[PDB]
Each structure stands twice: as structure tokens, then as C-alpha cells.
Design a protein around this ligand. Structure first.
Ligand SMILES: CNC(=O)Cn1c(CCC(=O)O)nc2ccccc2c1=O
Ligand SMILES: [Zn+2]
Ligand SMILES: [Zn+2]
Ligand SMILES: [Zn+2]
Length: 99
């Protein structure tokens, strides 16, 4: 992945409730291929399901989303995966909830 991107500044603190990697899409309710927004921690489906996270990006501008399938982080602006020290806490919390 990219080792940095200029949107990591928009990654917000993890809610104290933690993450729920089985949370369904906030729009369509699908259990499949959901992502969590690393700005506001809403959960929406991937582009191969109904594209609600892509829609969320379009109407919020929020840059970085984490996959509940493989804990990769995508930046919609950079059109790339990004991994940095600043993402370890949220990935670690997701990994603990998933496994
Ligand atoms: C399996 N990983 C992905 O699909 C990564 N990804 C993603 C991930 C986030 C998503 O599916 O909304 N979004 C894109 C949006 C427009 C264009 C490309 C992409 C993109 O390649
Ligand atoms: Zn959806
Ligand atoms: Zn968001
Ligand atoms: Zn970026």
C-alpha cells in the first residue's frame, strides 16, 4: 500500500464502543462486504454490493474507509490503499473484534 497519504489527518478517534465488524450497511442492511468510515465510523457496503460507502464518500467527502473483509484501508481521493502507524489502533481493534 502507500505508506502515507495527505488524508490521514481526517482519521478520527475510535469510538469507546469499539467496532462491530458484523455491523450491516447503514443504508441497505446488507451483511456483505461492509466498510467503516474512519472519519465518522458509519458502516456502508462496498462497491461490488450496492456502493453505499462510495455514496457516503460522495456526500461527506470523508477520505479513508476500512474493509471488514481484510482490514485494508482505502483512500477514495488517492484511489489507493494506505497503511501507516496512524491506522494501527483501528486495525488492531477491528482484528480483535473479527478474530
Ligand atoms: C476490493 N477493494 C476495493 O474495491 C477498493 N476500492 C474501493 C473500496 C471501497 C468501496 O468499495 O467503496 N473503492 C473504489 C471506488 C472506486 C474505484 C475503485 C475502488 C477500489 O478499488
Ligand atoms: Zn448498502
Ligand atoms: Zn464518513
Ligand atoms: Zn489520500
Amino acid at each position: 500500500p502507500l505508506p502515507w497519504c495527505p488524508h490521514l489527518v481526517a482519521v478520527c478517534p475510535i469510538p469507546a464502543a469499539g467496532l462491530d465488524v458484523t455491523q450491516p450497511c447503514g443504508d441497505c442492511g446488507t451483511i456483505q462486504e461492509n466498510w467503516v468510515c474512519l472519519s465518522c465510523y458509519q458502516v456502508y457496503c462496498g462497491r461490488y454490493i450496492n456502493g453505499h460507502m462510495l455514496q457516503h464518500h460522495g456526500n461527506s467527502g470523508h477520505p479513508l474507509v476500512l474493509s471488514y473483509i481484510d482490514l485494508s484501508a482505502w483512500c477514495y481521493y488517492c484511489q489507493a490503499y494506505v497503511h501507516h502507524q496512524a491506522l494501527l489502533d483501528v486495525k488492531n481493534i477491528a482484528h480483535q473484534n473479527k478474530f
